[PDB]
Amino acid sequence: RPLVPLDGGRFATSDLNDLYRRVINRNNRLKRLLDLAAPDIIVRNEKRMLQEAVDALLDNGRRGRAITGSNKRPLKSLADMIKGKQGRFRQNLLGKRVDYSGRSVITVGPYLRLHQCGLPKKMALELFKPFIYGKLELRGLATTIKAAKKMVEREEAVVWDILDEVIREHPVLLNRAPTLHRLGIQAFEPVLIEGKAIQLHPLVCAAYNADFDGDQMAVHVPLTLEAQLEARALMMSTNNILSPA
Amino acid sequence: TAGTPSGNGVDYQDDELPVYQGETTQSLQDYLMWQVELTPFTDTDRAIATSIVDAVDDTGYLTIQIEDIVDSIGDDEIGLEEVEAVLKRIQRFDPVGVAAKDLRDCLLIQLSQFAKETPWLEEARLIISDHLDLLANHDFRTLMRVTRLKEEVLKEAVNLIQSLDPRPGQSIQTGEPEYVIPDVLVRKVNDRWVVELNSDSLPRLKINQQYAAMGNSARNDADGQFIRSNLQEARWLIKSLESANDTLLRVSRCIVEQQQAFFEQGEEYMKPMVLADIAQAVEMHESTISRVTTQKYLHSPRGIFELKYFFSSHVNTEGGGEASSTAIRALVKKLIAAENPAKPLSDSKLTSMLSEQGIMVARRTVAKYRESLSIPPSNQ
Amino acid sequence: MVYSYTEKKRIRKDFGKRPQVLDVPYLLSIQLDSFQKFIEQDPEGQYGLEAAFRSVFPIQSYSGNSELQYVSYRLGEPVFDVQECQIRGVTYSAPLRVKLRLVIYEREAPEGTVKDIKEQEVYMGEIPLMTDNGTFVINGTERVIVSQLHRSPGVFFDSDKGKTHSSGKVLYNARIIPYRGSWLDFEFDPKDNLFVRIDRRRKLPATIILRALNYTTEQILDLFFEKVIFEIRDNKLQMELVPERLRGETASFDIEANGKVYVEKGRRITARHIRQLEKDDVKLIEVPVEYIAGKVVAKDYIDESTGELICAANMELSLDLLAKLSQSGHKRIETLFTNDLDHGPYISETLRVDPTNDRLSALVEIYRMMRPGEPPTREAAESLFENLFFSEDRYDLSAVGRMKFNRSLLREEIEGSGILSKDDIIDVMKKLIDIRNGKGEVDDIDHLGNRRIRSVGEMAENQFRVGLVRVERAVKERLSLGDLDTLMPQDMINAKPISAAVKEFFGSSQLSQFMDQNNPLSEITHKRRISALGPGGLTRERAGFEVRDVHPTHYGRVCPIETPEGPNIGLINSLSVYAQTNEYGFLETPYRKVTDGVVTDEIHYLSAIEEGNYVIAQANSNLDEEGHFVEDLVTCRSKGESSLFSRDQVDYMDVSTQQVVSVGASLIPFLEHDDANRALMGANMQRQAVPTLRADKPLVGTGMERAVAVDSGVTAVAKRGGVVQYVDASRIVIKVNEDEMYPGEAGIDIYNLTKYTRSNQNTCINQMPCVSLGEPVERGDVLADGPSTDLGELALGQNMRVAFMPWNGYNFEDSILVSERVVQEDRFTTIHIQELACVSRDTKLGPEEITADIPNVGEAALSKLDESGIVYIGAEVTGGDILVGKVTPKGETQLTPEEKLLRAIFGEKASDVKDSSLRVPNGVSGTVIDVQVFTRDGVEKDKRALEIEEMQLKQAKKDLSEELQILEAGLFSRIRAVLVAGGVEAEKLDKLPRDRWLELGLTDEEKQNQLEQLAEQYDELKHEFEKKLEAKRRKITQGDDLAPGVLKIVKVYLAVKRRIQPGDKMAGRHGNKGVISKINPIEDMPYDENGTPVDIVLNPLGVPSRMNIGQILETHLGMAAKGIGDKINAMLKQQQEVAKLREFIQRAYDLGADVRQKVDLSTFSDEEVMRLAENLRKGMPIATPVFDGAKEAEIKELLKLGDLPTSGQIRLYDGRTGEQFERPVTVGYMYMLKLNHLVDDKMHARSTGSYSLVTQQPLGGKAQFGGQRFGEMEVWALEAYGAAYTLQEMLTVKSDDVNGRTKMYKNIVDGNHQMEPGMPESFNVLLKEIRSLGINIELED
DNA sequence: TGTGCAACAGCATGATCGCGGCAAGCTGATCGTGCAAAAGTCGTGCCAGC
RNA sequence: GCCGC
């Protein structure tokens, strides 16, 4: 529940911390006033206000109106954090942003085989950077990881030769954004091309519900012996020819 | 405003329940531990590497001793012989020369990784770095005789030495926080130098507190009336903010009226303003005013940005009445700066000159002022 | 005369066929009219801040014998123009000055004064001003303000569709909307009882609000129901006859008229029996006593004997009660109608619901119900009721609201009070009651006669008022504590609230946003845009299907084509090309009056109701020479429908077919051959086109390109054009004709053409001259064209030679196959300009300095830096090159011996100062174009800055000295003429300067009058010019008042060229979009018999399933146009004599089937014919209006005149094999656009970067190096495949496993490929969040 | 024949309402107090190095 | 606000 920083050195308290501060302030004031033998009316008012503050902290907007912040929108409470589409269950878990991922516009490749796809060579060398580092250090071109990183940053020709071997036998996954069915993402053997657009086989367009008027796809790399095999044995385009409907 | 800077880049987490979340950043130790993970090390070697990487400063130097590293491990067969080997392995990382014991170590490690055919590598590998470093710090006129070499070759040997990186490991460091100042108290120049308080936002907080708390209370959807739940909380918030603003404004006003001499004409016209001097002016305790003036900053056309600077309680037993050392310090800086190429500036001579000017200051008092931000120009 | 100078250069061949009654409007007048009615003052309080000032002022403190009298206001002169404001990043505004007087009234003398201080005007706030194009430069941006379409204040009746209770019961409600204040509701429950919902509170019956107006139930009964008199005298108990009301009833007994039987008992009721009874004049007749049993007494009859009486109104009568009333002497008994045939039981039931019968009781009831807090004390309720409605300040219907209110209730008067009276609520309730009874009908809420428009002026006025009211509040208090010495500026001027509210509205508002600057047309569409959202509007989810539908009243007001697609469909609209707004604020469209059988050229503007009332003919109905319809039966619109009517029946005629098409849609040729939903796509995609290196006119147009190009303000238009004197790539100077001039000082026209500059979308806006030298120029001519404009015509794409065929799968789906000749010729190449800024601010360590020297940086990075430390103008920068060198100081006061050693060997700073410099971001390649150093007042001026100052002042004097030179030349000519009149030395006089010592004195009159006056004028002119130049110079060099922290700002501009590439998206203007699939070498493209290859290959399969027939017609017409241009080019190559070239041009221009455009080269200059021929050498620019354009036969005869096949299909050969294709392939010319979607701006790949602190998951989006989101459906697909290990590697490591990420990276570098998965941090965050509640959640073992 | 019980209609409240991507767009903190208690610092005088 | 559905 970290507070948000501001220009200079100022810090702004998040809506979670505001509820805690309100609860603590009310509790402290009630505790101090209870030792002073105050009249029962003020004590009852303080107890009710503390109960309301706790209720607002646990679930804002329940039993009354919702406490709002500087702007006229309710403060996010503990319950506003575990429920709904923006909650952890639907946002952070069951769905997650992942590394080794790419994206660009798709074009058509009619020279392509069914199991092949055209991958821009600029996307690769980034999606496969650890593999390139490993091959560079294995072949004696780079002794330290720093040397391999510097060599990749300069993009010498031997780095392109190493990249081609990395892409020699490693399947890749392409996915289109509204994945109604598992045909939404399919496995392919990447073919390195000069350009900035992914080349897609025309026979899988219907299954993807894709056309070449501005659609984009995402790219994912299965960096595991098990994941590579699963992509080759279960998710390749040449595997799923009949619709499972 | 004649010209306005473009808005700085900002971000906030959208479509996420814990709003603004955060962002990870890479530091020197984070980038060094990344390299440790990707080099072939044993378990004990990895432990030693983590131990000595934790001790690397922001400059990338090794603040703790090697013997202290050996002590920290407290493990048999982990003597300094292997700690040194792991240390050299770590020193040969991407910021070459990082995690070095001292300045000589940085230069020696940096010079090790070269073509070995550099025109003056061996001339400056050990002769200048590993020996007579203090001579290179000085003019090194006698160093030519010491190393049995002409001054001409040394003229570029020291050039290579300077070409070597002074403090490696602060290059990878980012530095996003500029630590800019909003200058809560802008003051301007008028016929009497009026002062003002900006960034109060008290009316802004008042309006928002109204529209939220008093807005909910006035909204008659809820039964009864919420005249005490939040209506008498917004009032307390406004009162607290206004009280703080008034106290700050009054204190800054007293400081400005007392130190108007600083802003007018030359800067070094500070009176030795003690906390009690403003405490009596505002008829309030010094401690409350002190806490107030600890980190509050004022915007000056020429003056420094800092309330605490004006206090300078430095009566210094000056000839006529009293004076301030900060003004005396500026005077000493100006006098020492404008001298002959020899520039004696002897602490006795400087004190005598100051006393002749009318500042009865001890001979050693001037020395501490000079050593605060300068070095004696061959006064020894 | 017939054609203007700019239009004689290249004349479009219009295909016309219908004369135009009126021309097209500016299209940006709306914004201009609104803001002019806002800032401009008015002698009345009708318009201008004047109305708000009169609404608030005068203000007086309570019992303060003090007043604030307001007199006039004035707007100051802006300190910067639009250009300097836009380059400096400030707001273009003006200072507001208002004069007011303070008068002190005498306390001792009633209504008397003792003091009156009328000090000068006071300053509050700054009013942003709109430019000549209708935009607001605030903080150096463009920020158009969009108009809003909301519900007009007034009264509205609805029925909630009659499906609420599932019983088939239709529930009718009435509603009152004011401009500001609380709302009022009247509803019907399924039990048919009046309910009042005040301010959306709980339902309350109408009797309490009825009684709160001092209405007694008896009085209410008479008003609510018509009463009937029952007379019981001498036991006869006669009944008054009302035959009109007695329509449907059953005769319980025999009815006799004057002792004669009229209607028998149970006799069938017939309109005939009622008429017979009415014909016979009959007095009161007796009735059965039992019948009165069901009647309800209306009044409260009093007993003359005792005070006891039957006051129980809304109650029936008993048999024993009859004896009581007979004994009391009640001869006549008043009862209400009690009839249910058309009328019904209302009000009385609501009276039975609630027993409160006193004004105080009703007031306390409403106070308790609306405010559930403390009970009132006869004063809180009394005050609250006044606050709710009919309060001068709290509640106000606008003049529009009052007009609508009176119109809905059928009142003759239009004007009235802004607050509702007692009679208004009575009339609303009566109308609502009558609506259920059968009379009247429910109104449409989506009818355009119920929807009003608010523009920028009215919203600005509303915001100004809130600032006024806010400031007025604070003003009232200090009058109580204000002494006579107090002055208006000291009377709580409070400039803060007014300026705060104004800047809040103008800067951060829903309807305030950046103007789209991709094209001039896109800016025009944004300027003429109508939104249903906003503060007073409706939210997106709160909208429904019927709100977003096309209404029949949308005909000539909003185009039914242009609208966004996904979420905002039907909620954002555009004005039709001819539409205009009413003074009240209702949309209007023009029609031509029809008198007898002939239409007249007089034009009337009719709102939705006005158009519905009359029979309006169609635009495409044929007419005669005298104006009479050729065909008797004509098609018209009568009332939301269409059918055949006689010509005399028509009362109005549509002015133009385009009347129903938006300006953006007006630009689609052959629109009527395109699907409306598909056309929507073409109109939307037309505004995303980016201007290319060179503008190219459309070969096929509609004739609206000139209006859009000129009215957008993108070009330079001669305001008072005379003759062009000097031309340059940056300046145009025009010598104004002497036929019109301003006396004194003469004058010339200076135009500073805009060079390359950034737009809001990072494109380039540039202007190039169209005139050469010594060219005559008329008023309104185009001198220089801006981005995507060609000789004053909108030119937003390029003309491509296209074949419609499949080519080996490279145009599969919507793919586009492009030749290499397109790339080589730099067509579809754009310039993109970016802005980077660096600011230096003082820090706790110290000031932040900008210097060329940088610690720990090699000489290579400083190669391109200036002495100050800035990249040289014209430098080419890539990657992470350094633009501005900046160093921030570090904090250190303890000098360690090593630190002293470091300072000894290295520089004094020893690199203590950190490096915070402006470097080019990765992926950004740019060339230094413009540096804009700004310096604080007092600090040392930057070394580069003086150069900018020198360029500024040099340009200032260069463009300032021209008028001085002309004026001094005129003075010299006058002096020479005077000396010629007497003592002329001719060349001897001309050789000696100063007029040869003013030619001595010569005659006494010349010396005393001529020479003396000439010398005086010379000296005065020289002094004035020197003063003006000095003032300009002093203005140029001035300290920049910056933010208190800010010390220096440096701005750097980069320019790049975008090469066309396959991943790029292209489109035509018929909804046909696609991305490039391949760039083909020139020898591979299909070619015709002459060896000319095509540029583009398009798939034929995209046409028939899209119904894009305008594609094919445009292609055929472009082929014809290029054929005519080819013939002209061939004639020009062989240098044929002008006569036959003129003959061929004439033959081509007058082709068609009775087209209106008449052009004859006979009145054309011989040289002008040559110039026109060279201008249309590439092709003839045809123009086909939207719904009245070219036909197939006309296209075919144009093809014949061009010597081309009539079918539009030619023989093509394969470029790779040389074989002829079997079928003929269509080849022609089509206008193709390049849209703002690029692979470079849409290519991203990440391996590993930064992660969110919460959930330990990678960030999202490019420009942040994020990862692609693996959503829920992706995980469902992986589960369906059965790929468990792929899913585990996506869900755990490589996402949120902090240790798993590093372990996997190390394994991959080692070539192991083993996941070793752990537990995600998001689940730990969830466990902590749940435990932070009262719930204990744990992991068992 | 008047009475008590169980089934039902009307109303109020709660919960839910697709998926990816790109822009432009931005929040503050308060006492205070006097008081000794404690820590800290400044002007001044020491002895050791040149 | 826009793009792909």
Ligand SMILES: [Mg+2]
């Ligand atoms: Mg598509």
